[PDB]
Amino acid sequence: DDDQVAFSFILDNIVTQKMMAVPDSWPFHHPVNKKFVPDYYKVIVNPMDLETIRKNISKHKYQSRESFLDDVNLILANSVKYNGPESQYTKTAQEIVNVCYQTLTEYDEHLTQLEKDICTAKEAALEEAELESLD
Numbered sequence: 306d307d308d309q310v311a312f313s314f315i316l317d318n319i320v321t322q323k324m325m326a327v328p329d330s331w332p333f334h335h336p337v338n339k340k341f342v343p344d345y346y347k348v349i350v351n352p353m354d355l356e357t358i359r360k361n362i363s364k365h366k367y368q369s370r371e372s373f374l375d376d377v378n379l380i381l382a383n384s385v386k387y388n389g390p391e392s393q394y395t396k397t398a399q400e401i402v403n404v405c406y407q408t409l410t411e412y413d414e415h416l417t418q419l420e421k422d423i424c425t426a427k428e429a430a431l432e433e434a435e436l437e438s439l440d
C-alpha cells in the first residue's frame with residue numbers, strides 16, 4: 306500500500322503544480338459543460354480533463370506512468386480532434402503534455418523504483434490469494 310500511496314501523491318503534485326500551472330490551461334482543468342460547448346460530446350467520445358485525472362489518482366487508478374500518460378495524452382488527442390492541430394487550445398494542451406513528460410523524466414529513478422515495488426506488492430498479494438483460496 307505505501308508505494309502506491311507515494312506514487313499517487315507524486316502524480317497529484319505533477320497535476321496541480323506543473324500541469325494546472327501551465328498559462329491559459331484553465332479550459333482543461335474541469336470537464337466540458339455542454340451548455341458552453343454544445344457539440345463537444347458529439348465529437349469527443351473519450352473526454353478527459355485534469356480534475357478527472359486527479360479523481361483517478363485519488364482512487365489509485367495508476368500503478369505506472371504508462372496508464373497515467375494514456376489519460377494525459379487523451380487531453381492532447383481530444384484537442385486536435387475538436388479544435389484542430391493549429392488551434393491555441395492544442396498549443397496549450399501540448400504544453401500541458403510537455404511539462405508532464407519533462408517532470409516524469411526528472412523523477413525517473415524514484416518512479417521506476419515505486420513502480421517495481423507496486424508490481425512486487427501486487428504479484429505477492431495474488432500468489433498469497435491463490436494459495437489461500439482453498440481455506
Ligand SMILES: C=CCCn1cc(-c2cc(C(=O)N3CCOCC3)cc3c2ncn3C)c2cc[nH]c2c1=O
Nearest residue numbers: 331332333335336337338341342353354384388394
Ligand atoms: C478538458 C478539455 C476541453 C478543452 N476545451 C475547453 C473549452 C471550453 C470549456 C468551457 C467549459 O465548459 N467550462 C470551463 C472550464 O470549467 C468547466 C466548464 C468553457 C469555455 C471553453 N472555451 C471557452 N469557454 C468560455 C473549449 C471551447 C472550444 N474548444 C474547447 C476545448 O477544447
